[PDB]
């Protein structure tokens, strides 16, 4: 009982520095043990698809003309993509006044 | 791996038992018991005991070795000075070390009787060894008896009752329970010692199924199995946290997704409901067979 | 005694041609066509038929009357086909339904006989110049008309087209009028008054009698209900004149006997808004209830009228069979092979060498008169 | 008179055998009667063609007639379950448009007002005041007829009219509970025959061929008859040419008497 | 090893919590590593966000809707244009009701 | 393990083992029918000077009838400092509460109904009174730093579910960095630290379906080749059937 609080305290502080340096150094473990599967899941898909989802639009040639046209598609393509969109909401609701 | 985990946690408990029990536990036992077969001591006690221990054992008390150098070191330093005439001066060691266990370590000797048991008889080998190392560490162990007569002058005789905690320095064979219970409250040191911290084989140290061995390699190449996604997450996670980057991400992804998120994400929520017009176009041709032919067919 | 006859006989011997084909009318005309100018063309005596072959132009003017006659025969039908139909009302109704086995292959032998004799009976100026072809034959009046059989049968065709479109007339109905009736009463004149509608007079004479109020006709249930209230609406009016009715009011029991003594006057003819207001349809509701179940046939009228048209329109299909299978209308040698078989062998070639001696004696008889 | 012989023999003796070479030619006449017939036979390319075309001017109608004028006959009874697509498709826009009829405009209007006032009939007879003569003349009603007493509660009042008391109601069954039937009977009570001419119009339209049905095919069978009457002309070729063939022998009997 | 002290398990409370107390810092070191277990699984949603909504989600949500965007801007439009012959002819009957 | 044993045995003392283990010191008031009957060796292994009083409490405890208030606190006369919680043992509400120390030397009497095992007279059934089980020895109790706190992976993973279990060794956490003990629960969230392959379908299909549709919708369903901006030209002609209800029902 002679050491008393010094049984823990000196080991307590010295445990903290190791609790900092290597605990977080070994913390990168989970960055590639539970994410190594993400390496075979997310990393591969982006290589396999993120470039290919650019290449998917070789069929969508005119769609690819809208992503770059975002400067003007908010009125041009919108008047195409929303005029038909407005086909629905103003059809059923505005006709409900007939029974009145 | 996990020896990188032990860099700084071993400097307050590892140096708490060996540095003190090396001289009262069994060293007097083995020295006195070594009289029967003393051949190894012939070629070692000349230099290994008094001199070779200076690099490791004599540096522990070097902090207090200045003011009290000649406390008990006198019984060893003085015979060494007469090495040129050491042939005719060899009968004074056992007498010059008798006071060591009579004044310097007399309270210590009482605790050390168990270690003195097999060497109380053969003190010749024991006191010779006591000259080399036991007297030197006793210089550290004589600090408590020596300092009482000097520093607490107003409280010299009064403190002898309170010095029971301070008396542990000579009587140093019953304090082992200190470190004995220590490495449970701070078992967070290692596993190779009596403690445990470098434990387990599945998620601590031999987590080599992908965790520990890779963790060592997560500084060279095994950390690249996944983290490269972020660079090809330029449409994604890298430009996630920065929405302004996400804003220009959509601007810069104007080969893959900008249209879907900016030209028709603004209409995708009210778009799917026009599958009905597909049915209405092909629903008015049912009555081209029944009406006029069966106006009164019933 | 008998030697005197020999002197006069040399002339009659040397004039065989002047008699050998005069009974041969198909060859008499052609021989007298050439022998008239001079007796050198008397060679064309049996060559007269060969001259009759050479008489195509003579046959042409012989057929020139036939050219106009058949054309008038075509047009005599046009000007008056009633006389044509007089013997042939049955044709527009039962030429196919009844005269099926008559016009298969012997149509231009019996349908001619059944018509031609009664044809002359009604259309008199056609059958008096039909057999005249036979007297001239392929010499004049069978080969020349063969060179003009198309003209008579194509000039007749022009006048056929205005009767061939009888199918086109129903063709107008069957799909064209089916296409025609889309919006004639919707687009030609809005709120139509077109004369194309005629079967609406039933409502015109009766439904116009009340066309102003709605509920009196829109609700036929409450109509007579409230039309009959006109009989029940007089209760308020009767009580209005109570101040005049006090003449007999003298006691409690002075009105009970008056309920009919005064009732014998008010009760009179005043019933015209209860039964006469529905007297024009209820009378049809006591004898025409079964036709409501029978009303299927009324809707089936178009569904059934075309059935008798099939009898006309299958006749339309099969008059062509009465015509096309009558391929021998203009093949007038169909029965002339049986005629031809009569003169395969009787076209004797004994006279080609035997009576040559007679004509040689006739040749020698042209100069014996010098004695 | 003897000079007549010298004048005649110099000119008469010139005809020779070529004048009567009918026998010299006679082989050519036997087949010549066929040769003129052969020219008619050579016209068979047109003779067999002119008969077909004349049979085909009325048969020009095959599609427009036969294949069309029994088509809706095929779509007449067997299509009573299916006529709406087989042949009514051409007539589609009129059948329903004429089935609704334009009479609806003058039929329905505001009824709550009419139910209060206009639903009621209007009177045209003024026989209500018939009593107002005898009503005022009580002297002949209570003081002269005097057919009444204290016992005349009902016996006198029943004297003028008693049997009519039970023969009163005749126009019932339209006063109540007839209301719901305003759904369909609107065009079946008074306008029962609202569209009894739609298919009757077709009946006449089916019949619109009478401008030429008076001819129709009467001409055709007579055209077959008449054109036969023209071209049958070999009839006399089989007896008189034969006289130039068989009876042609008789000229040898002339010389029999001389020989 | 709880049943074998059938009598004096009640005084074994010092051997219960410390039984993992020495192994406590075992866990917390490896669960300082689990600070990255947020990153590998929990922060996926942070990662997946803007990895889909402007990269892949609308490149899904606004892609298979081309089964309907096309079937609404074309199927109504393109089909009646390319089949106008029967579109007009069919409406002959219904328009008269 | 043994945390539940702080309560399964203690409820016995307050009510059931009150004549047995709760207050044998107070039970000297009952010694005429509790000590000589059952609690002789219980008193012998619990009390002080009354502990050796085996056969003399039948005729020499007359002075205890006026002692129960202080006779109960004599529960640990051997452990005089421990004999303070038996004073409040009169009050069952707090007497039952104060057993982090009182229970310790009453171990010899609730479970050791035969308390006379030559050792628990003074010590609180800790050192070799528990020698029936070798694991119960105090020397091997601390050996859990060598044997018990190491199985394979399981028990450390069986406690990480909660973020508040770190009682024994948390001092070198609570000073400056306990955030690791805050992420103590995330291993429960992510137990499959290696496989975790559940995201194969959801995240990949956010991208994989794009390429597959390019190979799937062979220009028949996906009629969007060059017409996407072409639609902008002729929306109105088909939109005329929008305005017919609006040209009349405006």
From Swiss-Prot, chain A:
Provide the phenotype resulting from gene inactivation.
No visible phenotype.
- Superkingdom of origin: Eukaryota
Q: Which family does it belong to?
A: Belongs to the QWRF family.
How is the quaternary structure described?
Part of the augmin complex composed of 8 subunits. The complex acts on microtubules and interacts with gamma-tubulin in spindles and the phragmoplast.
Q: What does this protein do?
A: Contributes to the assembly of the acentrosomal spindle and phragmoplast microtubule arrays as part of the augmin complex.
Q: What is this protein called?
A: AUGMIN subunit 8
Species annotation: Arabidopsis thaliana (Mouse-ear cress)
From Swiss-Prot, chain C:
Q: Which residues of the full protein are shown?
A: 181 to 570 of 796
Instruction: Report the locations given in the UniProt record.
Output: Cytoplasm, Cytoskeleton, Spindle; Cytoplasm, Cytoskeleton, Phragmoplast
In the record, the note on similarity to other proteins reads: Belongs to the HAUS5 family.
Summarize the subunit comment.
Part of the augmin complex composed of 8 subunits. The complex acts on microtubules and interacts with gamma-tubulin in spindles and the phragmoplast.
Describe the inactivation phenotype: Lethal when homozygous.
Entry coiled-coil feature ranges: 263-302
The protein's name in its UniProt record: AUGMIN subunit 5
Superkingdom per UniProt? Eukaryota
Q: What does this protein do?
A: Involved in microtubules reorganization during spindle and phragmoplast development.
From Swiss-Prot, chain D:
Changes seen on gene knockout = Lethal when homozygous.
Q: Which ranges of the sequence are coiled-coil? A: 150-170
Keywords in UniProt for this one?
A: Cell cycle, Cell division, Coiled coil, Cytoplasm, Cytoskeleton, Microtubule, Mitosis
Major place of residence: cytoplasm
GO cellular component, alphabetical, reads:
HAUS complex; microtubule; nucleus; phragmoplast; spindle
Q: Superkingdom of this entry's organism?
A: Eukaryota
Query: GO terms for biological process?
Result: cell division; phragmoplast microtubule organization; spindle assembly
Q: What subcellular locations does the record give?
A: Cytoplasm, Cytoskeleton, Spindle; Cytoplasm, Cytoskeleton, Phragmoplast
- Asked whether the UniProt record includes Heme among its keywords, one would answer no
Task: Report the sequence similarity comment from the record.
Answer: Belongs to the HAUS3 family.
Its quaternary structure?
Part of the augmin complex composed of 8 subunits. The complex acts on microtubules and interacts with gamma-tubulin in spindles and the phragmoplast. Interacts with AUG1.
The role this protein plays is:
Involved in microtubules reorganization during spindle and phragmoplast development. Required for gamma-tubulin localization during mitosis.
Q: What is this protein called?
A: AUGMIN subunit 3
From the UniProt record, report the name of the gene that encodes this protein.
Answer: AUG3
Swiss-Prot record, chain F:
Regions annotated as coiled coil: 169-197
* Provenance organism: Arabidopsis thaliana (Mouse-ear cress)
What this protein is called in its record is AUGMIN subunit 7
**A GO CC term?**
spindle microtubule
Question: A GO BP term, please?
Answer: cell division
Where it mainly occurs, coarsely classed, is: cytoplasm
- Swiss-Prot/TrEMBL keywords: Cell cycle, Cell division, Coiled coil, Cytoplasm, Cytoskeleton, Microtubule, Mitosis
Which Gene Ontology terms cover its molecular function? microtubule minus-end binding
